[PDB]
Every structure is written in C-alpha cells, then in structure tokens.
Write a protein that binds this DNA or RNA. Structure first.
Ligand SMILES: Nc1ncnc2c1ncn2[C@@H]1O[C@H](COP(=O)(O)OP(=O)(O)OP(=O)(O)O)[C@@H](O)[C@H]1O
Ligand SMILES: [K+]
Ligand SMILES: [K+]
Ligand SMILES: [K+]
Ligand SMILES: [K+]
Ligand SMILES: [K+]
Ligand SMILES: [K+]
Ligand SMILES: [K+]
Ligand SMILES: [K+]
Ligand SMILES: [Mg+2]
Ligand SMILES: [Mg+2]
Ligand SMILES: [Mg+2]
Ligand SMILES: [Mg+2]
Ligand SMILES: [Mg+2]
Ligand SMILES: [Mg+2]
Ligand SMILES: [Mg+2]
Ligand SMILES: [Mg+2]
Ligand SMILES: [Mg+2]
Ligand SMILES: [Mg+2]
Ligand SMILES: [Mg+2]
Ligand SMILES: [Zn+2]
Lengths: 134, 118, 48, 177, 299, 74, 80
RNA sequence: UGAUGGAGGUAGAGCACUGUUUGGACUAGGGGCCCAUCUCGGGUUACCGAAUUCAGAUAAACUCCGAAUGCCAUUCAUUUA
RNA sequence: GCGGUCGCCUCCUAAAAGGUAACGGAGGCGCCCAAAGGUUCCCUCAGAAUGGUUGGAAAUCAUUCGAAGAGUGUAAAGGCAGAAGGGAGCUUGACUGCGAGACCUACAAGUCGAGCAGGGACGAAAGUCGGGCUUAGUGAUCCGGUGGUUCCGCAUGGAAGG
RNA sequence: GUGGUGGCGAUAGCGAGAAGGAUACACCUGUUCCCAUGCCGAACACAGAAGUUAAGCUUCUUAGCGCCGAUUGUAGUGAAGGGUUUCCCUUUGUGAGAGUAGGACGUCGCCACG
RNA sequence: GCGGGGUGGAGCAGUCAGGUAGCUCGUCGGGCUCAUAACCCGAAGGUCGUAGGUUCAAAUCCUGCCCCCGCAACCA
RNA sequence: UUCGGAUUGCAGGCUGCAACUCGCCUGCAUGAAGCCGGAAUCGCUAGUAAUCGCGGAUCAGCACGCCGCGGUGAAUACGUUC
C-alpha cells in the first residue's frame, strides 16, 4: 500500500494525542480490530496483518482495511552526520490513535473471525481488541 | 425557448455599482431617477436619513404631458422648483443605472436650468 | 528590448521626465503631453 | 413579408387552437436565426476565411461577425483568438425573408434532397439545420465558390417544447423526413 | 574600415584579417575547452581526493576569467537564397509577336512590323543601347503599352512575371510584409521567404519608403519568385544589387526551368544566365547568342 | 535546495477598536482587502487601511462575511 | 442597421419557371429583368426553374419510375 | 487584576474547497474473446475501469467552522509604583 | 575538506497580535506592459447537457443548467464576480512642488498617507487619476559621463575648475 | 393595493405551486426621429398605446434545498497538581466543531399614486 | 550528485546564430556479369527521445520529464 | 483534347447442355494511365527496316500468338581500333 501521489515529498512526523477523530466503530464488517494504543503502522505491517487474516479465513468472506499509510517517513543512512537537509523518503505509515478500527471482516462464523483477528493483531505493533458490529 | 432578461433587473445591477460612489446627504441629497416605458420619476432623497425630501413625476397632474422627452424636462423643472422651496440647492445626480443620454439627460438639464446646482 | 529613456520638453529643451520603453514595440521616439515645471504648463515631451 | 404574414395569419391561430393557450402571448414564434460557418481552413490560409465571409455576407445580406477561437488548441494548429468561423444574426423582417427563401429556393437545390432532419432539436424547441454545401442559395452564383463549404443554421424560437417548435417550423414549411 | 589600394586589395586585406581573427578565436576556444575538461574531471572525482578537488576549484577560477575575455566570432552575414520554380510548363511557343509597330505619341516609331517568336525554356536577351526601346518592348508585352500595330499573343500555358526597370511595383506607404501579401500564400510562408531575402523578424514591418534601393530590389525579386511564373520578363534585374547578390541572382536564373526575356547592361550577369537568342535594337535582328554580341555593340 | 525566505512584513492590525487615532494613522496592514475601509477610512496603494480624520477606531462586520474599519470623530 | 458595411440588399421577386409560383423576398443578387406586383409596384425578377412547388419532394409524388425488379427485367427480356 | 470592545485562523473539530483514500451501486471507456468483419454489428469475463452517487477515513504547507490563552485599546474601576 | 549557500519576494515551520532559528519543508526574482496605465461607459466566467457540414474528446454556433469550480502578465499567499476579471471611446496622473500623521526600524534605509498648491486627463456631474489586484524585478559612498543652473570664480574681467 | 427608494448577517434566499393588472410596472408596436449593434432597433435610444397576464413583476401556500440555531454532553485548553512522563491522569475555570430541540417563505423606514 | 547524449536501419552533420531536414554506409527494386563481387540507375527509410512554453514560425531557444553512457556517493 | 481507349454500368448478338468462377462480339453510357520513356538493351544492309491490311492451321465458340500473302516503302555502311 502506497499513495499514487503525494502533494509533498517530505512531511512532519506529527504528534498522536487523544482518541481517533473518526472511524472508531465497525462500519462495514461484522467484526473489527480496534487499537487500544496509539502508534505508527507501516504498510508492511498492514500487509502482513491482511495476509494472516485472509489466509486463515481461506480467502472467504470479506476484509476491509480501514487505515491507509498516507504519511511518509524518511531516514538517514549510517555514517551520515546530522544536517545537510532532511533524509530521503524511506517508508509509509498510517498514524493510528487508540480507538481506531484498523480492520473489519464479515461473511465468516464468529470463531473464525475472532481467530483471524487475533493473528492479525499479533502481526501489528499495537495492543488490540475485537469489536462486533452494533 | 429563450429567456429575455428583466430590463429592470439589469438596470439595478448597473445601479448598485452607480450607487457605490453616489450617496445623498442632508446638504447634498441624492437626485434619483426612475424610468418607465410610460413615465419617469425623480426623487430627492437623504440616504443618511433614508427619506425622500422632494419628489416629482409624470403623475403630478401639474405636468400637462406630451412627448416623453418633454415630460422628462417638465418633471426636471418641477423637482428643481420643489427642491428649491425646501431650500435644496446642491444635489448628486443618480442616473439610476440608465444611460445619461436621452430622457434622463433631458430631465437633468431641466433641473440644472431651474436651479439645482450639479 | 526594454530600456530607460529621458523625455525632454520640446519647448525649453529641459530633460524633465524619466521613463522606459520597449524598443521593439515602440521603435520611434516616444512623445507625450507632460507638465513642464520650468514653463509650468503642459507641453510636448519627446524622447532623446 | 410573405412568411411573416403567413405566420401571423395562419400559423398563430392554428398553434393557439392546437395547444390550447390561455392567452395569445403564449404563441411560439421565431425569435432569431443564427447562421454559423465553421472555417478551420483559416489557419492554413486566412483567404479561405475571407471567401467564406464573403459568401456568408452575400447569402445573408449582413456583414458577419468573425468569431475567434476562445482557446488555443494544438490539435488543430489553432491559437486562441484566431479568426476561425463566422456567424450572422437575423431578426424580424430580414429573418422572415431569409427563412422563406431557405424553405422555397435553397432547400430544393440541395443535392439529392429528401427533406430535412426531424431530430435536430436541442430539447427546448430550438432547431438547427446543417447545410452540407453552399451553392444552394441563388445569391451564391454557383461560380465564385473556389472551394465548396457548408454551414449550420440555428433557428431559435420561443417554443417551450420540441413538439411546438416542430409544428411551427412545419407550418412555416419544412420538408421533414 | 578604410584601406589603401583597390577593390582586390581590400578583399585581400579583409580576407586575411578575418582569417587571422578566426585563428585567434580558435585558440582561445581550445584553452577554454582544456580547462573545462579538467574542471569536469575534478568535479566527478571522489570527494576523498582532496588535492584534485582543490585543483579543480583553482582551474574553475581561471576558466571563469577565460570565458569572460573570450572574443565572440562575428556572425557571418547571411547570403540570399533563391529557389525559383515554375508552377506550370512552358510551351514550344510561349510568346508570339507579329508585325508589331509602336510609337510614343509625338515621337519616331521605335520599331516597325516587329515579329519574333520565343521557343520555351529559352534565354532571350533584348540587346541595345540607352534610349533605344528595350524597356518599351518589355512594357509592350505585359500590356502597359498597347501596340500601335500588330498582335502579341501569350499561350494559355504561359504565366508572366515582370520586373520593372524603375521599381514601380512597390507601395512606399505600406510595409514590406504588406507589399508581398498574396491570396495564395500564408503569413509564415511570406516570412520564411522574406528571411531568405535577408528580411529578418521585425525587418518586415519597416515601411518601403525607408529602405535602400538595393533592399527594395530584393522585394521586387521576392514578388517575382512568389508568382512561380514560367515566363520571366526582367528589365535590368541586377541593378541596385550588391555584387554578391548579383552572382546569386544570375546562377539561380541559369537553372530556372522556364523562358527568360532579360535586359542587362552587366556583362557578368548575362554570361551566368547563358543567353540563347539575342534581339538587337533598334535594328531588329533575332540572332543566336554568341560573342558576336560584341560585334553588334561595336557596330 | 531549500533555505530561502523573505523578511516578515509586520502585517495585521495597528490600532485597537475603541482607540483614538490622529488623521492619517495606519489602521491595518494587509495583502488584498482582508478588511474593507469604512467611514473616514482610506485604503492605500498596497491595501493598507488608514484614518482620514481624527477619531475612535471601530471594527465592524460588512454584511454576513466581510469586516470593515471606521473612524468616528468625537 | 449600420451603413456602408452591409452587402447591397434589395427586394426581388422569384418565379418558378416550371410552375410559375411567385413570391417576393429580399436578396443580395439583382436581376436585370423586372416585373410588376400587386400594390402597384415593380421589383427585379430572379427567375428560378426549381422551387418548392416544382421540386418532387414537396409535391409528394416522384417523377422517377423507381427502377425495375430484376425478374421483371428478365420477363421483358425473354418474354416471360 | 476585573469589566468592556476588538484584530487573528492555532488546539480541537469537519469534509463545504484542494490533495491523499476504503468499500458498495452503476457505467462511459479500456482490455480479452467469439461470431461477422466493411473491425466491424453484437454477447461475454461477476478482467481493469473514468465520471456520478451511497457509506467511511485522512492532512504542517486542506478549511464550511473554531476555542482556551496570549495581544491591542479604554480620560473605565481596585490595588500598586 | 568536498558538495551546498550568501541579496530580494511568497507559503509552512510559527505554538489563532506582531516577531521568532536550523546545511528545516516548498517555490520564485534580477522583469514585463505605450497598454497589460488613467478615466467614462458597458459586459460576466470555467465546465456540463442537448442539437447541429467539414468537425473528430476537443475549432466555431444555439438553448438550458451552472456563485465561481474561471480569469486576474509573472512564484505562492492574501483579495477580487458591486469586480481588481473582460470589451470599447478619449487620453498620458507612469504629473511638478510637497506633505499633517502613521507603520516599520540599531543605523542606513523601507512602507502608507489624507490634504494644499500648480497645470492637466476622463466624465454631464459626482468625482477618479502622483502607474499596473497586493506583496519581489534591486545596489551605499567615492569616481566619472550627459543636461540644466539668477550659485562660486584665489588682485580685478574672463577662464579653468567646482 | 401598487410603484419608486432605503436600513437590517438569506430568520430577507432557492425550489415548487396558486391568484392579478383597476391603477402602476411590464411585456407589447415601430425605427422618423437623437442614439446603437466589433452583424442584428435582440440590447442600448427614441416614438406609441393594438393585445396579454403568457412571462417578468407583486400577493399568497408550502420546510424540499439553502439559512439561523438553544440546552446537555464531549474534544480542546488557561491556572494548580500527579503519574509507570513520546503519553496519561487529577482539581478549578473556560468550552467548541459535530449532532440535535426549534426558528424561519422577513422585518424596520420614507415618498407618489389608490 | 557531476557530466555526456537521444535526427532515417547504423554511424554522423545540421543545434550555438529560428525559416529549408541532410552526408556516409546500409536496405529494397532494376541494370551489367555465365554467376558473385565491384560498378551503373531508380526508390524508400525520420515529422529530429518525449510533454509543455517562446515565436509569425522550433530539430535549433526555454522548462520538465523518460531513456542510454562514464564518474562519484567519503576522506585522519 | 473531337488524342487515348483501360476500367466500369446498362442493354444485347452469337456458339454451345451450359458464358458465375470463365468465351468472343455489338450498342448506349463512363472515359483510366499515358505528353515519347533512367541505367541499360533489341531487329534490320532492299523490295529489307518501317508500316498497311488479307488468308490460313488449331477450332461448336474464342489470338494482340504462329504460319503464310501481298500493298506502300526508306536511312546508312567511312572502316575493323574496340
Ligand atoms: N512614357 C514615355 N513617354 C514619352 N516618351 C517615352 C516614354 N517612354 C520612353 N519614351 C522614349 O522611348 C525611348 C526609348 O524607350 P525605352 O524606355 O524602352 O528606352 P530603353 O531601351 O529602356 O533604354 P535604357 O533602359 O538603357 O535606359 C526614350 O527616348 C524615351 O525618351
Ligand atoms: K500486537
Ligand atoms: K492545520
Ligand atoms: K480603456
Ligand atoms: K421593441
Ligand atoms: K405574468
Ligand atoms: K425561506
Ligand atoms: K465463360
Ligand atoms: K475460328
Ligand atoms: Mg530602360
Ligand atoms: Mg513571509
Ligand atoms: Mg501601486
Ligand atoms: Mg489538528
Ligand atoms: Mg502566538
Ligand atoms: Mg503570528
Ligand atoms: Mg489587470
Ligand atoms: Mg579672478
Ligand atoms: Mg455550534
Ligand atoms: Mg500534346
Ligand atoms: Mg546480312
Ligand atoms: Zn518646457
């Protein structure tokens, strides 16, 4: 997952405080994975979680990825002193604040849903919990 | 199917822009002109007070009538003398969004001759 | 090609005004009606 | 005056009766006729536009307005403001005269004439006739034209519906297919 | 620049000076290229090569000072380019003149029962002396003068282009571009050809009244070229033209694939065109062209 | 390469509402007409609002979504 | 209407040479032949051979035979 | 310090604009693919799918909105200097 | 060290006055216009749908919808549809001598400015005009050139030179 | 009641529908007139009163769109504190946006004709 | 990151300094030859890498972009 | 082009069992390229070349080919270097 375009190549790291602005409730799926902490989530982590979830579901049902790694983060190569401008863009992250529903799933029995979400959570860097559509 | 714009609406679109730099005071009231297919009307107004100090039109019954241009000239004379009676001498001429060419021009010249200073 | 020019009063030959012009767009010497402070009246000023 | 007389006398009562208008003011009428000649060849040679302008002026009896490209388009070698295409506006008596001549003379002279379309309506009661070639108008003289060209004649009426516009145009004389 | 001597001496002195100037500019360019080549070599060297990087900056300073004292070679003045081609093809009888007599009212008859016939793609020279009727004859063909007697017939395949002697075909009030305006040519086509005649950019908006006689002659020639006629009636074409342009004019006419009726008192120009038949005046004599032209001049 | 910037132009309001100011005092610096000139207030060549007369400054709203400055003499 | 910029426009009568249908309308072209007209007036006359009345489409009846069927051609060919 | 009046677009929030973006409905169009070609006339992938619309997100260089504070000023009030 | 940078304008950083740094994140300037200035008058856009010869997604034309989704010479921000956008007529205020009072500011500078006088442009008049929608398009002194000058002129008149 | 002309944030609007021209305003009739169309008396300007409320126009109904919008709660935050201190929590003050109850198919003036 | 280049099949001009697309070899066709080579005669082959600006006009000037080549990407 | 006579549409005459693949010919209509042909290359020395017709074999039908017949009827040959 990478945006097709970005208005600005480089961007602030930002600050994650408080609950998520929106998307805290399961919208489409019957079950959802809610993050109980705030943390960056890389496109690599999202893909790993997605693969785990779908493969356990046997590619059945439907999966939604609510988050998207809009933000970019740069880095400086080893042996480079501080300064001389910002580092080159390296990866993509989505700032996820506690309460956000990162993934949703539907079309599968509850045990399968809970197990698939558990596998995805272990792939992710945040503590999570399972939530049902209201 | 074709819509013919309201001439009065177009007049008023021009008239707003006209009024943006024309305003009537107690010592220099606004001489507003309105023009109809049949008649023509002049009002001496105090925008600060929002009151028509004096008025004249082709319905005063003091203007015998004639060609519409001549009626405008008579209305100009009548408003000038009425304004003079109320002591109004200097005015700012609001052409009401029309073109200062024909009936309005005749009315304005009549007012100038009959004593309004502008 | 744009260059600064001087406009001189044709009457008193006084270099009165400073301006500029694009030679390509105005090949011929510019001429204007400008106030001449020495003569204190508007006169024809021509570029030199 | 023939077509104006025809309209006011025959067409107006007929339309009133057919469409059950409360007041005569509702009667549709030909507001204007706009004839547009699109000359893309002007870019290659402005004299093409000049000849087209001369032809249009002779056909219409009025000096045309030389329209200009509102935008620069590289696809047509076109720069914004280039004088490509002309038009003429006709109202009242001149409008009636030109419309009558089109109905009577020019249309028959069209090659393999089987009538005019019956679907070229904008959906508001305004019609347009796409002339493929000139030389159908007698004023052309069939010889001055070095290069044959077409045009688009837009008839604008007060009809609210394509149905009313069709009736008015047919009554004025229009060989619909 | 003022030289002592004659035209050849000026050419010899001038040609040498431009040669010696050219060699100077060549050597200044070589030294600049040499420094440039080293500056680039240092620029792309590793950042760890401190001494080379240092030397690269030092030579960058010399390179800058060189590029600021490097004489510009003057742009060689561009010569005229003419490509005259006929639209249509010549006939075996382009022009028929039969029993043509003409006199200016009140003056002796210039020629009586003049009859000649051109062949097509022929170089026809109307020889004579001053005030003998050469320009009158050419004016006669075009229609400026109506023949007193006889007929002049042009084949329907013959298109004619006229270059008048006194430059009477230009509007002094209008500009260069306005004069050459034609219904058959678009704007950029006119500009391109005017550039071939050394009228560059806004030089075409100049009024014809301010041009020199030589520059006006080019406009008339340009008008002749744009006609693309197959018959060229030219009355002293090389007049007012600089010697370089004359040779260009003669060479291109020589290759012209059409009939040429020419008048010229310039011996060089006629030789380049390669005349075929010469018509002597006032003694009408349609003759094959040869060094016998000198015999008529002597007699 | 980045690292360029222009000197700050010290824009904004230069006189508080309800303050007394002498004629010609600058009331507001701006690019464009962020606030319009009201009564006895002129707008300079670079959109600067200044007082034409001595008086107290007042910032009002010109209609629904536009602001305005007026100077009222006492 | 602006002056001296519009092409010369004049009233003119048209007659269908085949049928004689008449109508008066303006035109840029002028005709040396002129005719009288009701209201005691005369106008240049521009004769035309083909008009609405003459033209087949307006009439609704076609002058052409619409060609023949091939078998009918053959019928006439071999008398069958 | 309080009272009053102000200027401003931050925190937050929001999608009304501009970028980024998820799923659903529909589909122009594009891809294959056949028949029939005059590529041409169709019927197809639940193939990719613009634009619209429904739902749901996102932003230092987005804002329909918008604080707490701070700031400017008042012949203002209390205290102080 | 190498690379990059050095002055000016715009945005974000900048923490809702102002100001605020980094070899922080992005872009521009060293001009242009004789109209692309002033004034009087007049006009309203971009796109879409539908119909229409060449003509095709898209040239020009017509109706309707369409509040700005256009345009504003030139970066961005701010502003502008009572126009600052667009067209036309006449013009040169892209004036001279100034200038109460302000902003900005270490200084040098920089910015705004009603209003007075002179003589004008446009307009019937009101009135507007001391360049351009606003903010970059620039360089101290010394030295030298050119023009003007009722200024000085080493005993005096000139001159030279200031 | 209609027509001019204004003030007030569209609570004044937009959309849809209904009624009227007695007057007035309008369409509306023409281009001879001053004046005009980068062509058109469509517009502008002028002269006039054959017909019509058809349209605009004014009056009325409507909460569909837009507009205004309370309270409560919450985010945020000044001050005083705490913690396991990228963050989070406590006390006190302030307090949105969003969402909603609801308001609203305008009101406050002057003049001429009725 | 620093430079060098993108024009016919290949290699090269033309670019600076705006008007008009070329040279060499090669290819195709036809000749000559018993046949091949050499030789002779015809013809084709690019809208100049690409997208936008400047211009009346762009292979040529400006800007970006995509490709290919060489070098560099860290020194006591 | 009143040169040219291809191509094409139509309408027909024949032979044949049969004329679409695929015959020849006729009338009407249409009216193509082609303006004397690059490098190179062919035949011919007199009733010959050139050019004009005519008959024939094959053959139901079908030649611009082949064989044969006559009509008109030239230019040039210095010479054997190549
Ligand atoms: N328009 C004229 N009116 C009267 N006489 C004329 C006119 N034109 C020419 N002539 C006379 O005709 C004579 C010859 O005419 P023309 O112009 O042809 O001379 P030319 O051959 O051109 O001589 P050149 O060109 O060398 O000067 C002259 O003597 C001249 O005087
Ligand atoms: K985890
Ligand atoms: K923000
Ligand atoms: K103007
Ligand atoms: K009218
Ligand atoms: K109505
Ligand atoms: K409402
Ligand atoms: K056959
Ligand atoms: K046979
Ligand atoms: Mg002569
Ligand atoms: Mg700044
Ligand atoms: Mg300014
Ligand atoms: Mg925020
Ligand atoms: Mg702050
Ligand atoms: Mg600030
Ligand atoms: Mg402007
Ligand atoms: Mg002395
Ligand atoms: Mg609220
Ligand atoms: Mg021939
Ligand atoms: Mg022999
Ligand atoms: Zn003077």
């Amino acid at each position: 997952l990478v945006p097709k375009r970005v208005k600005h190549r480089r961007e602030f790291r930002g600050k994650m405080r408080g609950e998520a602005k929106g998307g805290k409730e399961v919208a489409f799926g019957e079950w959802g994975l809610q993050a109980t902490e705030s943390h960056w989530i890389t496109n690599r982590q999202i893909e790993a979680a997605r693969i785990a979830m779908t493969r356990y579901m046997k590619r059945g049902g439907k999966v939604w990825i609510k988050i998207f790694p809009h933000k970019s983060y740069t880095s400086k190569a080893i042996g480079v002193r501080m300064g001389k401008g910002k580092g080159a863009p390296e990866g993509w992250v989505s700032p996820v604040k506690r309460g956000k529903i990162m993934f949703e799933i539907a079309g599968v029995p509850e045990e399968v849903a809970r197990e698939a979400l558990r596998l995805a959570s272990h792939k992710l860097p945040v503590k999570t919990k399972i939530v049902k559509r209201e | 199917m074709i819509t013919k714009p309201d001439k009065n609406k177009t007049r008023q679109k021009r008239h707003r822009r006209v009024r943006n730099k024309i305003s009537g005071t107690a010592e220099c009231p606004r001489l507003n002109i309105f023009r109809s297919n049949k008649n023509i009307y002049a009002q001496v107004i105090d925008d600060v007070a929002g009151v028509t100090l004096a008025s004249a039109s082709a319905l005063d019954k003091e203007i015998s009538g004639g060609t519409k241009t001549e009626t405008a000239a008579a209305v100009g004379k009548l408003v000038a003398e009425r304004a003079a009676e109320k002591g109004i001498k200097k005015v700012v001429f609001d052409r009401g969004g029309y073109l200062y060419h024909g009936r309005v021009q005749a009315l304005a010249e009549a007012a100038r001759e009959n004593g309004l200073e502008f | 090609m744009r260059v600064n020019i001087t406009l001189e009063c044709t009457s008193c030959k006084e270099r009165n005004y400073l301006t500029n012009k694009n030679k390509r767009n105005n090949p011929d010497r510019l001429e204007k009606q400008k106030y001449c402070p020495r003569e204190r009246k508007v006169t024809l000023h021509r570029e030199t | 005056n023939r077509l104006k007389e025809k309209y006011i006398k025959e067409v107006t009562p007929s339309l009133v009766e057919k469409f059950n208008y409360s007041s005569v003011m509702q009667t549709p009428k030909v507001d204007k006729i706009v004839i547009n000649m699109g000359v893309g060849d002007a870019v290659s040679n402005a004299k093409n536009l000049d000849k087209a302008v001369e032809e249009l002026a002779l056909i219409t009896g009025q000096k045309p307005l030389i329209t200009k490209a509102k935008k620069s388009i590289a696809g047509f070698r076109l720069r914004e403001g280039m004088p490509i295409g002309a038009k003429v506006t006709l109202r009242g008596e001149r409008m009636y005269e030109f419309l009558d001549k089109l109905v009577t003379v020019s249309l028959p002279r069209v090659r393999d004439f089987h009538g005019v379309s019956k679907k070229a309506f904008d959906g508001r009661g305004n019609y347009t006739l796409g002339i493929k070639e000139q030389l159908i108008f007698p004023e052309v003289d069939y010889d001055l034209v070095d290069k044959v060209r077409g045009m688009d004649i837009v008839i604008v009426t007060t009809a609210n519906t394509d149905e009313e516009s069709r009736e008015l145009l047919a009554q004025l004389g229009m060989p619909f297919q | 620049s003022i030289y002592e001597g004659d035209y050849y001496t000026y050419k010899k002195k001038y040609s040498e000076n431009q040669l010696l100037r050219e060699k100077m500019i060549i050597q200044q360019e070589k030294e600049v290229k040499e420094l440039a080549t080293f500056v680039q070599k240092a620029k792309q060297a590793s950042q760890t090569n401190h001494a080379l990087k240092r030397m690269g900056l030092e030579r960058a300073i010399r390179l800058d000072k060189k590029k600021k004292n490097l004489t510009k070679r003057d742009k060689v003045y561009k010569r005229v380019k003419m490509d005259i081609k006929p639209n249509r093809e010549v006939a075996r009888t382009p022009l028929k003149v039969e029993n043509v007599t003409f006199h200016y009212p009140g003056h002796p008859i210039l020629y009586k029962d003049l009859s000649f016939q051109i062949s097509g793609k022929e170089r026809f020279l109307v020889v004579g002396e001053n005030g003998v009727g050469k320009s009158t004859l050419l004016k006669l063909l075009m229609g400026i003068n109506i023949p007193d007697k006889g007929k002049i017939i042009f084949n329907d395949k013959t298109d004619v282009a006229y270059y008048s002697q006194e430059l009477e075909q230009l509007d002094e009030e209008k500009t260069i571009l306005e004069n050459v305006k034609s219904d058959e040519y678009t704007d950029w086509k006119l500009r391109a050809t005017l550039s071939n005649f050394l009228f560059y950019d806004d030089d075409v908006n100049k009024k014809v009244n301010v041009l020199s006689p030589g520059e006006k002659a080019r406009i008339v020639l340009c008008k002749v070229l744009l006609q693309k006629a197959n018959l060229l009636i030219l009355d002293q074409p090389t007049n007012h033209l600089d010697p370089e342009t004359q040779s260009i004019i003669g060479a291109n006419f020589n290759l012209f694939e059409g009939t040429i009726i020419v008048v010229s008192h310039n011996p060089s120009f006629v030789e380049q065109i390669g005349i075929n038949r010469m018509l002597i005046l006032p003694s009408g004599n349609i003759d094959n062209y040869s060094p016998e032209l000198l015999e008529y001049y002597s007699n | 390469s980045n690292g360029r910037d222009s000197e700050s132009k010290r824009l904004g309001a230069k006189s508080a509402d309800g303050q007394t100011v002498t004629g010609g005092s600058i009331l507001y610096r701006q690019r464009g007409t962020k606030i319009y000139p009201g009564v006895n207030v002129g707008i300079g060549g670079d959109d600067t609002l200044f007082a034409k007369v001595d008086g107290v400054v007042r910032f009002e709203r010109k209609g629904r979504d536009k602001k305005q400055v007026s100077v009222y003499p006492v | 209407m602006k002056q001296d910029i519009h092409p010369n426009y004049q009233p003119v009568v048209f007659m269908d040479s085949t049928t004689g249908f008449k109508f008066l309308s303006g035109s840029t072209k002028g005709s040396s032949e002129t005719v009288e007209w009701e209201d005691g007036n005369t106008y240049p006359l521009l004769r035309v051979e083909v008009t609405s009345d003459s033209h087949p489409f307006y009439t609704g009846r076609q002058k052409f035979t619409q060609a023949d069927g091939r078998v009918d051609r053959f019928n006439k060919k071999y008398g069958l």
